[PDB]
Amino acid sequence: GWASETAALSETATPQIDRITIPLHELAAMPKASQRLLDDSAFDIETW
Amino acid sequence: GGYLVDPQTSETIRGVLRSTASLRQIASVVNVEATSFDVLVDKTDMGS
């Protein structure tokens, strides 16, 4: 306002508010690894 | 009158018996944790 000394300050606005919906999809990958490799391939294939 | 008696089955079901002589008795078995195994032989000998 910059309200005066004797002003009788009326109503003022209050901000309109928007909601945005993040959909939160998933992201999935599925490699196929073999049991002969995982038993015999001394590098840790699981954490690799 | 025949319904009220059921035949007695065997206690463990059985199979045709087969031989276990398998050459693993005489060959050299080794414990291996790899995709393969190597053996290293001397196909010749030295000189004097």
PDB file of C-alpha atoms in Angstrom:
ATOM      1  CA  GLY A   1       0.000   0.000   0.000  1.00  0.00           C
ATOM      2  CA  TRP A   2       2.358   2.638   1.338  1.00  0.00           C
ATOM      3  CA  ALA A   3      -0.563   3.333   3.628  1.00  0.00           C
ATOM      4  CA  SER A   4      -1.128   6.927   4.689  1.00  0.00           C
ATOM      5  CA  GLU A   5      -1.663   8.291   8.177  1.00  0.00           C
ATOM      6  CA  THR A   6      -5.467   8.125   7.794  1.00  0.00           C
ATOM      7  CA  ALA A   7      -6.081   5.744   4.905  1.00  0.00           C
ATOM      8  CA  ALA A   8      -8.632   2.990   5.811  1.00  0.00           C
ATOM      9  CA  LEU A   9      -6.567   0.296   4.100  1.00  0.00           C
ATOM     10  CA  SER A  10      -8.777  -2.019   2.053  1.00  0.00           C
ATOM     11  CA  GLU A  11      -8.270  -5.575   0.835  1.00  0.00           C
ATOM     12  CA  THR A  12      -5.248  -6.554  -1.216  1.00  0.00           C
ATOM     13  CA  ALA A  13      -4.437  -9.595  -3.321  1.00  0.00           C
ATOM     14  CA  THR A  14      -2.848 -12.849  -2.159  1.00  0.00           C
ATOM     15  CA  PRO A  15      -0.986 -14.884  -4.816  1.00  0.00           C
ATOM     16  CA  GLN A  16      -2.720 -17.568  -6.835  1.00  0.00           C
ATOM     17  CA  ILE A  17      -0.980 -20.906  -6.488  1.00  0.00           C
ATOM     18  CA  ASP A  18      -0.234 -23.638  -9.037  1.00  0.00           C
ATOM     19  CA  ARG A  19       0.396 -27.330  -8.383  1.00  0.00           C
ATOM     20  CA  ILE A  20       2.734 -29.275 -10.653  1.00  0.00           C
ATOM     21  CA  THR A  21       2.580 -33.074 -10.443  1.00  0.00           C
ATOM     22  CA  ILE A  22       5.892 -34.855 -10.961  1.00  0.00           C
ATOM     23  CA  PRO A  23       4.663 -38.206 -12.348  1.00  0.00           C
ATOM     24  CA  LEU A  24       7.656 -40.227 -10.989  1.00  0.00           C
ATOM     25  CA  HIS A  25       8.082 -42.890 -13.649  1.00  0.00           C
ATOM     26  CA  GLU A  26      10.400 -45.853 -13.285  1.00  0.00           C
ATOM     27  CA  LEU A  27      13.450 -46.771 -15.334  1.00  0.00           C
ATOM     28  CA  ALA A  28      14.250 -50.454 -15.643  1.00  0.00           C
ATOM     29  CA  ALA A  29      17.017 -52.438 -17.315  1.00  0.00           C
ATOM     30  CA  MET A  30      17.467 -56.210 -17.291  1.00  0.00           C
ATOM     31  CA  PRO A  31      20.785 -57.689 -18.434  1.00  0.00           C
ATOM     32  CA  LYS A  32      21.005 -61.438 -18.877  1.00  0.00           C
ATOM     33  CA  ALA A  33      24.106 -63.016 -17.368  1.00  0.00           C
ATOM     34  CA  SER A  34      25.037 -66.671 -17.204  1.00  0.00           C
ATOM     35  CA  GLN A  35      25.700 -68.909 -14.214  1.00  0.00           C
ATOM     36  CA  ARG A  36      28.856 -70.331 -15.797  1.00  0.00           C
ATOM     37  CA  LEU A  37      30.197 -66.778 -16.084  1.00  0.00           C
ATOM     38  CA  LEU A  38      29.236 -65.673 -12.570  1.00  0.00           C
ATOM     39  CA  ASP A  39      30.838 -68.705 -10.938  1.00  0.00           C
ATOM     40  CA  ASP A  40      34.046 -68.658 -12.960  1.00  0.00           C
ATOM     41  CA  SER A  41      34.749 -65.047 -13.958  1.00  0.00           C
ATOM     42  CA  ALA A  42      36.532 -63.850 -10.798  1.00  0.00           C
ATOM     43  CA  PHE A  43      35.655 -60.175 -11.317  1.00  0.00           C
ATOM     44  CA  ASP A  44      32.583 -59.494  -9.209  1.00  0.00           C
ATOM     45  CA  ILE A  45      29.955 -59.509 -11.964  1.00  0.00           C
ATOM     46  CA  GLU A  46      27.094 -58.756  -9.550  1.00  0.00           C
ATOM     47  CA  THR A  47      28.491 -55.460  -8.291  1.00  0.00           C
ATOM     48  CA  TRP A  48      29.951 -54.776 -11.736  1.00  0.00           C
TER      49      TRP A  48
ATOM     50  CA  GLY B   1     -17.417-106.089  -1.779  1.00  0.00           C
ATOM     51  CA  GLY B   2     -14.136-105.579  -3.618  1.00  0.00           C
ATOM     52  CA  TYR B   3     -14.011-101.819  -3.041  1.00  0.00           C
ATOM     53  CA  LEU B   4     -13.419-102.068   0.695  1.00  0.00           C
ATOM     54  CA  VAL B   5      -9.856-103.388   0.401  1.00  0.00           C
ATOM     55  CA  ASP B   6      -6.962-101.408  -1.090  1.00  0.00           C
ATOM     56  CA  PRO B   7      -3.648-103.021  -2.063  1.00  0.00           C
ATOM     57  CA  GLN B   8      -0.483-102.437  -0.063  1.00  0.00           C
ATOM     58  CA  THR B   9       2.212-100.651  -2.028  1.00  0.00           C
ATOM     59  CA  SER B  10       5.958-100.933  -1.589  1.00  0.00           C
ATOM     60  CA  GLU B  11       7.648 -98.786   1.020  1.00  0.00           C
ATOM     61  CA  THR B  12      10.164 -97.083  -1.303  1.00  0.00           C
ATOM     62  CA  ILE B  13       9.652 -97.037  -5.050  1.00  0.00           C
ATOM     63  CA  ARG B  14      12.487 -98.722  -6.857  1.00  0.00           C
ATOM     64  CA  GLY B  15      14.355 -98.709 -10.129  1.00  0.00           C
ATOM     65  CA  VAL B  16      16.458-100.800 -12.460  1.00  0.00           C
ATOM     66  CA  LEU B  17      19.942-101.010 -10.961  1.00  0.00           C
ATOM     67  CA  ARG B  18      22.855 -99.890 -13.126  1.00  0.00           C
ATOM     68  CA  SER B  19      26.604-100.081 -12.740  1.00  0.00           C
ATOM     69  CA  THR B  20      28.634 -97.454 -10.902  1.00  0.00           C
ATOM     70  CA  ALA B  21      32.122 -98.414 -12.130  1.00  0.00           C
ATOM     71  CA  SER B  22      32.820 -95.148 -13.849  1.00  0.00           C
ATOM     72  CA  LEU B  23      36.613 -94.456 -14.335  1.00  0.00           C
ATOM     73  CA  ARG B  24      36.385 -91.647 -11.787  1.00  0.00           C
ATOM     74  CA  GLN B  25      37.545 -94.427  -9.445  1.00  0.00           C
ATOM     75  CA  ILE B  26      40.919 -94.600 -11.201  1.00  0.00           C
ATOM     76  CA  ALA B  27      41.474 -91.188 -12.781  1.00  0.00           C
ATOM     77  CA  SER B  28      42.691 -88.117 -10.909  1.00  0.00           C
ATOM     78  CA  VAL B  29      39.895 -85.735  -9.930  1.00  0.00           C
ATOM     79  CA  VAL B  30      40.758 -82.157  -8.999  1.00  0.00           C
ATOM     80  CA  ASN B  31      38.737 -79.339  -7.470  1.00  0.00           C
ATOM     81  CA  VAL B  32      38.591 -76.438  -9.912  1.00  0.00           C
ATOM     82  CA  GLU B  33      36.883 -73.044  -9.623  1.00  0.00           C
ATOM     83  CA  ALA B  34      37.380 -71.611 -13.113  1.00  0.00           C
ATOM     84  CA  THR B  35      35.908 -71.918 -16.581  1.00  0.00           C
ATOM     85  CA  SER B  36      38.654 -74.369 -17.529  1.00  0.00           C
ATOM     86  CA  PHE B  37      41.786 -76.103 -16.323  1.00  0.00           C
ATOM     87  CA  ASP B  38      45.242 -76.540 -17.763  1.00  0.00           C
ATOM     88  CA  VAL B  39      47.785 -79.284 -17.469  1.00  0.00           C
ATOM     89  CA  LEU B  40      51.433 -78.750 -18.328  1.00  0.00           C
ATOM     90  CA  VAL B  41      53.414 -81.741 -19.544  1.00  0.00           C
ATOM     91  CA  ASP B  42      56.908 -82.386 -20.882  1.00  0.00           C
ATOM     92  CA  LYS B  43      56.413 -83.964 -24.272  1.00  0.00           C
ATOM     93  CA  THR B  44      60.202 -84.488 -24.504  1.00  0.00           C
ATOM     94  CA  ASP B  45      63.231 -84.555 -22.211  1.00  0.00           C
ATOM     95  CA  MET B  46      66.648 -82.958 -22.028  1.00  0.00           C
ATOM     96  CA  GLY B  47      70.080 -83.691 -23.409  1.00  0.00           C
ATOM     97  CA  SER B  48      73.330 -84.797 -21.799  1.00  0.00           C
TER      98      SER B  48
END
